[PDB]
Design an enzyme around this catalytic site. Structure first.
Site, short mmCIF file in Angstrom:
data_model
loop_
_atom_site.label_atom_id
_atom_site.label_comp_id
_atom_site.label_asym_id
_atom_site.label_seq_id
_atom_site.Cartn_x
_atom_site.Cartn_y
_atom_site.Cartn_z
CG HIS A 32 -10.03 -30.90 1.56
ND1 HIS A 32 -11.10 -31.33 1.22
CD2 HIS A 32 -9.60 -29.92 0.79
CE1 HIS A 32 -11.75 -30.82 0.00
NE2 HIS A 32 -10.79 -29.90 -0.36
CD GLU A 56 -12.62 -33.81 2.91
OE1 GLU A 56 -11.89 -33.27 3.54
OE2 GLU A 56 -12.86 -33.37 1.56
CB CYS A 131 -13.63 -27.66 -0.76
SG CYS A 131 -13.33 -28.83 -2.24
C1 LIG Z 1 -12.05 -28.17 -3.22
O1 LIG Z 1 -11.02 -28.34 -2.60
C2 LIG Z 1 -12.19 -29.28 -4.32
C3 LIG Z 1 -13.39 -29.08 -5.42
C4 LIG Z 1 -12.97 -29.45 -6.96
C5 LIG Z 1 -11.98 -29.76 -7.74
C6 LIG Z 1 -12.07 -29.57 -9.03
N1 LIG Z 1 -13.54 -29.67 -8.87
C7 LIG Z 1 -14.13 -29.35 -7.86
O2 LIG Z 1 -15.44 -29.32 -7.61
N2 LIG Z 1 -11.83 -30.62 -4.04
C8 LIG Z 1 -10.67 -31.16 -4.56
O3 LIG Z 1 -9.90 -30.97 -5.06
C9 LIG Z 1 -10.81 -32.61 -3.73
C10 LIG Z 1 -9.86 -32.75 -2.59
C11 LIG Z 1 -10.13 -34.10 -2.09
C12 LIG Z 1 -8.90 -34.35 -0.93
C13 LIG Z 1 -8.97 -35.51 -0.21
C14 LIG Z 1 -10.38 -35.96 0.34
C15 LIG Z 1 -11.63 -35.96 -0.49
C16 LIG Z 1 -11.46 -34.63 -1.29
N3 LIG Z 1 -10.56 -33.60 -5.07
C17 LIG Z 1 -11.04 -33.79 -6.07
O4 LIG Z 1 -11.97 -33.26 -6.49
O5 LIG Z 1 -10.62 -34.65 -6.90
C18 LIG Z 1 -11.12 -35.12 -8.21
C19 LIG Z 1 -11.95 -36.40 -7.96
C20 LIG Z 1 -11.61 -37.32 -8.50
C21 LIG Z 1 -12.24 -38.54 -8.22
C22 LIG Z 1 -13.57 -38.41 -8.06
C23 LIG Z 1 -14.00 -37.15 -7.60
CL1 LIG Z 1 -15.78 -37.20 -7.26
C24 LIG Z 1 -13.43 -36.19 -7.81
#
Ligand SMILES: *[C@@H](O)[C@H](CC1=CC=NC1=O)NC(=O)[C@H](CC1CCCCC1)NC(=O)OCc1cccc(Cl)c1
EC number: 3.6.1.15
Length: 165
Positions: A32, A56, A131
């Protein structure tokens, strides 16, 4: 165990995040963060790149040596369960922030409506923009890469890396 400068020099700004030079020709990143609507990566036209994507996890194999200064290193299909790995985070400021993580199981995590195949770990925090940073560990004299950063919970205590498996 401290990551040496050459290893950090593999961590490369890419799209909205980072990626990692596994060898002179192979680059891995989190799907992504990959830029969309471009005709080239690192000056190389897309048609000269073998682009493999599995959820991913994205891998690029270039037709020319892009980092001839580097040795190939091992890419594992996932991180060893129970092991402490390091996430080699670079911040946009240039700050180096290696984070220790105890890796869990390869599974599918519910993330923003999606069921995301990956590997979880517990931080022993990551932020938007991180990421693609690599998950590595040292086996003897040599470092190995096993995943790329993809997500973390609101508390930051649980992280998820994309894996090749
Ligand atoms: C980098 O793009 C990032 C890292 C990040 C954000 C906040 N703390 C971090 O380490 N990733 C994301 O924002 C990620 C994006 C998705 C996009 C769709 C495919 C999967 C990744 N989303 C994210 O971290 O969301 C919060 C979350 C919710 C539920 C569970 C988990 Cl493990 C995370």
């Amino acid at each position: 165990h401290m990551a040496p400068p050459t290893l950090w020099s593999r961590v490369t700004k890419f799209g909205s995040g980072w990626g990692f030079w596994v060898s002179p020709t192979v680059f891995i990143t989190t799907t992504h963060v990959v830029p969309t609507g471009v005709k080239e990566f690192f000056g190389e036209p897309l048609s000269s790149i073998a682009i493999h994507q599995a959820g991913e996890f994205t891998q690029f194999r270039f037709s020319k040596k892009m980092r001839p200064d580097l040795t190939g290193m091992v890419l594992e299909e996932g991180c060893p369960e129970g092991t402490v790995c390091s996430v080699l985070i670079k911040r946009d400021s240039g700050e180096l922030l290696p984070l220790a993580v105890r890796m869990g199981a390869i599974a599918s995590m519910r993330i923003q409506g999606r069921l995301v195949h990956g590997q979880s770990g517990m931080l022993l925090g990551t932020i938007p923009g991180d990421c693609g940073a690599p998950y590595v560990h040292k086996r003897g004299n040599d470092w190995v890469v096993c995943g790329v950063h993809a997500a973390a919970t609101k508390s930051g205590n649980t992280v998820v890396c994309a894996v090749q498996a």
